[PDB]
C-alpha cells in the first residue's frame, strides 16, 4: 500500500510513481541528501514512467541549499541544434506544418540535457555517487517491473508513433501494446545506464551513443550532429522572486514562461480578494478565466530564451501594469478580444522581436 499523503520527521519524497518514491526514500534512509535522492528519482522515473521524462529530455531543477541558504535552478532545457533554422517548421508554402506531424520528426529533437543536469546537481550538492544512485534503475530496466495504469493507457494512446520506430520492440512486442500489470523490460536502456555508470556522462554526450543518437535524428529528418552533443551544457539560472500574501516565492525564470506568469496571475488576482467568493462560485471561475486570458496573451507576445530575446520582466510585473490589466476584468462581462498589454510603458528598452500570431 502506498499513500498520496504522508508526514515525516526527517524528510519527505513525493513523486508520480511509487517505485520512484521508494527509491528516493531509500536514498534518504541510507544517509543521502535531497539532491542525491532527486537524482536517483529521475533515473527511476526514466524507467518506470518512461513516457514522461528521462535522459532523452530536459528539465528545471530548483534547489534550496540548506547550508548556504541560496536557491538556484539547474536548467537542463534542451537546445536547438546548430542546423536548426527559424523556418524549420514551415512547409514549402511558408505555412506551419500541422502540430501532430511536427511531433514525430527529427527536427523536433532538442539536444538532451537531463543527464548533464544530474551530473551538475551531484557536483554541486551530492554526497552519493552517480554510480550508487543509478544502480537501482539499472536493475528496474534490466529485470523489469509491472506497468501501472497511467503507463498502460499511454502505450495504448500513443501506439501509432511508437509503431514507427525502434520503440516498438520495447512497448509493442509482437505488435501488441503491453497491458496494466504486464512486465516492462528495457534491456537496451539498462545497457545505456551501465555505460553511464562505467564511463560517466561521456557515455551519452560523446562516443558511439552520441553518434547513434545523432545519426538517428538525421534519419528522421533532423540536423543534430555529434558536435551539438559535445557543445551541450546546462545553465545555472537565478530564480525570479515575488511576494504573495506574506510568502516569498522563488520560481522559474525564462527560458520558462512559468515563473513570470505565475507571479503575474497571482498579482492580478490578489486585487480581487477571491476568498470573499465561495470556492465553487461562478464569480471565482470567471475571475480565474479572465486573468488567464490576459496573462497567456502576454506570454505569447513576450516570452522566450533570455540569451536571445528581451523579456520585459520589470514591465510585466510592475504594480502599475498589474493595475491596468486588472482594470480590464469584469465579473459580469467577458473580454472577447483579450490581447497582450504594453509592459514597455513600465520599463526601459524595447523588443528585439516582432508580434507574430501563431496558427
Amino acid at each position: 500500500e502506498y499513500k498520496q499523503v504522508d508526514v515525516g520527521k526527517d524528510g519527505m519524497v513525493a513523486t508520480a510513481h511509487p517505485l520512484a518514491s521508494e527509491i528516493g526514500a531509500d536514498v534518504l534512509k541510507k544517509g543521502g541528501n535531497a539532491i542525491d535522492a532527486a537524482v536517483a528519482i529521475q533515473f527511476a522515473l526514466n524507467v518506470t514512467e518512461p513516457m514522461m521524462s528521462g535522459i532523452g529530455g530536459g528539465g528545471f531543477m530548483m534547489v534550496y541549499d540548506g547550508k548556504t541558504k541560496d536557491t538556484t535552478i539547474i536548467d537542463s532545457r534542451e537546445r536547438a541544434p546548430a542546423g536548426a533554422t527559424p523556418d524549420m517548421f514551415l512547409d514549402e508554402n511558408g505555412k506551419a506544418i500541422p502540430f501532430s506531424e511536427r511531433v514525430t520528426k527529427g527536427t523536433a529533437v532538442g539536444v538532451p540535457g537531463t543527464l548533464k543536469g544530474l551530473e551538475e546537481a551531484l557536483d554541486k550538492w551530492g554526497t552519493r555517487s552517480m554510480k550508487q544512485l543509478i544502480t537501482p534503475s539499472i536493475k528496474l530496466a534490466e529485470k523489469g517491473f509491472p506497468i501501472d495504469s497511467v503507463l498502460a493507457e499511454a502505450i495504448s494512446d500513443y501506439q501509432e508513433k511508437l509503431s514507427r520506430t525502434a520503440a516498438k520492440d520495447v512497448f509493442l512486442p509482437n505488435g501488441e501494446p503491453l497491458k496494466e500489470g504486464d512486465t516492462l523490460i528495457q534491456k537496451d536502456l539498462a545497457k545505456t545506464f551501465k555505460l553511464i555508470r562505467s564511463k560517466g556522462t561521456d557515455a551519452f554526450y560523446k562516443g558511439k551513443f552520441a553518434k547513434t543518437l545523432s545519426d538517428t535524428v538525421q534519419d528522421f529528418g533532423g540536423s543534430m550532429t555529434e558536435k551539438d552533443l559535445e557543445n551541450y551544457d546546462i545553465t545555472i539560472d537565478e530564480p525570479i522572486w515575488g511576494d504573495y500574501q506574506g510568502y516569498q516565492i522563488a520560481t522559474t525564470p525564462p527560458p520558462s514562461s512559468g515563473g513570470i506568469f505565475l507571479l503575474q496571475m497571482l498579482k492580478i488576482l490578489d486585487h480581487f480578494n477571491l476568498s470573499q467568493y465561495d470556492v465553487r462560485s461562478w464569480e471565482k471561475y470567471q475571475l480565474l478565466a479572465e486573468t488567464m486570458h490576459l496573462s497567456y496573451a502576454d506570454r505569447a507576445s513576450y516570452a522566450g530564451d533570455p540569451e536571445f530575446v528581451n523579456v520585459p520582466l520589470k514591465g510585466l510585473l510592475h504594480p502599475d501594469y498589474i493595475k491596468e490589466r486588472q482594470q480590464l476584468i469584469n465579473l459580469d462581462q467577458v473580454n472577447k478580444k483579450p490581447k497582450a498589454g504594453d509592459p514597455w510603458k513600465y520599463q526601459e528598452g524595447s523588443a528585439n522581436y516582432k508580434q507574430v500570431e501563431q496558427p
Binding site: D6, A14, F60, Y64, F89, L90, V103, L288
Partner: protein
C-alpha cells in the same frame, strides 16, 4: 512531463519538473540504446519573428514552473506540475487554494481546476459545477461538454516549528508521498 519534490533533514529542498515534451516524445528510440527522444523543439513558435521563434542553439520556451515558497526566510512549500501551458494554471490554483482559501494541502491539490489560454481553448476538471459552466458559457466562455484532468501536483510542506514534513501526490496519477522517520 513529471514533477517531483524532495526535502531532507539538513534543510535542502528540491522541486524538479522534467520532460520529453509529448508523452513518449517524438516516439523515436535510439536503436540498441533504449533512449526515447524528446520532441521539445515543437515548443518553439512554428512561425518565426517573435520572442519564441526557433534559432540554432536557442532553447524553446517552457511553461514548467517548479516553485518554492518561503516564510520567515525558510522554505515552507514546494509546488510544481506537468501539463504544458496548463502548468502555470495548476501551480497558480494550488497556491490560491492553499493560501488564499486556506485549504489543507491535499484538499488544495484536489480542488477542481480550470484552464483557458484563449477564447477558443478551455478545459475543466470534474467537479466544476454544471450551472457554473452554464453561467460562464452564457457570458461567452467556451467550456466543452466533458471534463479532463488538469495537471499533477506533487507538493511538500515544511513545519519548522514542529520539525515535520508533509508530502502530497495528486490523484490524477498513481503517485506516492513517502515520509522519512529515521531509526
Amino acid at each position: 512531463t513529471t514533477h517531483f519534490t524532495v526535502a531532507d533533514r539538513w534543510g535542502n529542498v528540491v522541486s524538479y519538473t522534467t520532460t520529453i515534451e509529448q508523452l513518449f516524445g517524438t516516439g523515436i528510440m535510439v536503436p540498441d540504446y533504449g533512449v526515447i527522444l524528446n520532441n521539445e523543439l515543437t515548443d518553439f513558435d512554428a512561425i518565426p519573428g517573435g520572442a519564441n521563434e526557433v534559432q540554432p542553439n536557442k532553447r524553446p520556451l517552457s511553461s514548467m514552473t517548479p516553485t518554492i515558497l518561503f516564510k520567515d526566510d525558510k522554505p515552507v512549500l514546494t509546488v510544481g506540475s506537468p501539463g504544458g501551458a496548463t502548468i502555470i494554471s495548476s501551480v497558480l490554483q494550488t497556491i490560491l487554494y492553499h493560501i488564499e482559501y486556506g485549504m489543507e494541502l491535499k484538499a488544495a491539490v484536489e480542488e477542481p481546476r480550470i484552464y483557458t489560454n484563449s477564447m477558443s481553448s478551455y478545459r475543466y476538471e470534474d467537479g466544476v459545477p454544471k450551472d457554473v459552466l452554464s453561467k460562464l458559457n452564457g457570458m461567452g466562455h467556451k467550456f466543452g461538454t466533458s471534463p479532463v484532468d488538469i495537471g499533477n501536483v506533487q507538493s511538500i510542506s515544511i513545519d519548522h516549528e514542529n520539525g515535520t514534513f508533509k508530502g502530497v501526490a495528486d490523484s490524477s496519477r498513481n503517485g506516492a508521498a513517502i515520509g522519512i522517520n529515521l531509526k
